[model samples]
Target: SPEIMKNLSNNFGKAMDQCKDELSLPDSVVADLYNFWKDDYVMTDRLAGCAINCLATKLDVVDPDGNLHHGNAKDFAMKHGADETMAQQLVDIIHGCEKSAPPNDDKCMKTIDVAMCFKKEIHKLNWVPNMDLVIGEVLAEV
Candidate 1:
């Protein structure tokens, strides 16, 4: 039984290695992994909301003088044509953004602002859109 489990783990590692090298894993495999792990591995909605709030505070989008201008991250999702399931993935990014960079850091604020601005610009374009195309363009720029 132990040997079988070890073999299964090794096979899973090999699968991941192959996936990384070729970037050719089917969407279904990723979807299955997301479905299996999301509830537990992903941050809860409350934590995500907190992260966004923290980001907003850092960006001066929430005023020190007692006003608030919340970023419409959900709107970004809808504008980008993310379905309900995909929209939830935004929470993961929001969570990562806050954790990876502290509030009031210029890099953090710029990253969040740029993302919001990009979504706004994309929404205005009214052009044919594909996530792959967007990603390819971004990678090319990098």
Candidate 2:
């Protein structure tokens, strides 16, 4: 039993290591992603609902009550105290997050829906891109 457990742990660690290397990102990214998902109190799902909500807040796309109102993230940002330039920047971030998101399945469609909705909203407001890089890179090996 002990040997089996040890092997399992070692295999998981190896998988994580490969994931880090293939993702072209630092371990901190993976750790942060894991922590974000864990905070949602659900492990069976890959999308971090809580983290997504937090990101929405950061982009000013969602209100304090988590209600999405505007057609664009930039609009929300401007309405929520961000200037035109800053709103555009936040829209870029939201889009980056959307681009980095994994494929959607029936179970994870909600996550994809939210991400796409955020992007659509940003697009409708004529937002400009700020960041050229992806928000979170995925590992091919994992």
Candidate 3:
């Protein structure tokens, strides 16, 4: 019985030990990630709209008051080992530069017209282009 109880305690300790170490945030950097997420758990989850979205004050392709094109995000994503999903969210720090939290609703506020302007015709049929070569390499298979 002692051995069984010891095993249970060890397993519980190990389960709780799973962290690197634990999330530490600034007191002012307020946003309920659990509200964004489910207070759940292993997840560099895409577009959960948590604080990781705005991890930087300055970045490549981010220029002139965070008014950036997708290419900016692409370069940013490539440089920081992020993906389009993450890059899409980069517009937070990307938002004319806002707080890291969801102070401005943390929505993807692109000037859709900005995105629209980048529209291209690869073979004379209008299609959005994938300018981020890093992001596109794997999807190139698709």
The candidate maximizing TM-score is 2
Q: Candidate 2's residue-wise lDDT over 33-125, tens digit each?
A: 445323232233334333333333332222332322333544434443566677555545454555665665333344544444444444545
TM-score for all predictions?
A: 0.25, 0.31, 0.19
Alpha-carbon deviation at 7 in model 1, angstroms? 49
Q: Give Cα distance to truth, residue 67, candidate 2, Å.
A: 10
- Candidate 3 lDDT by residue in tens digits, 18-130: 21013334323222322322222222333222223232221211222232233355543444345565544433322322322233342223211112112211222232223
Rank by TM-score, highest first. 2, 1, 3
What is the lDDT of every predicted structure here? 0.35, 0.38, 0.28
| Better lDDT candidate (1, 3) | 1
Instruction: Give the better candidate number (1 or 3) by TM-score.
Output: 1
**What's the CA RMSD for each of the models?**
17.8, 16.0, 15.9
Q: For model 1, state the Cα shift of residue 37 in Å.
A: 27
Q: How close is candidate 3 to the true structure, as a TM-score?
A: 0.19
Counted clashes in each candidate structure: 0, 3, 0
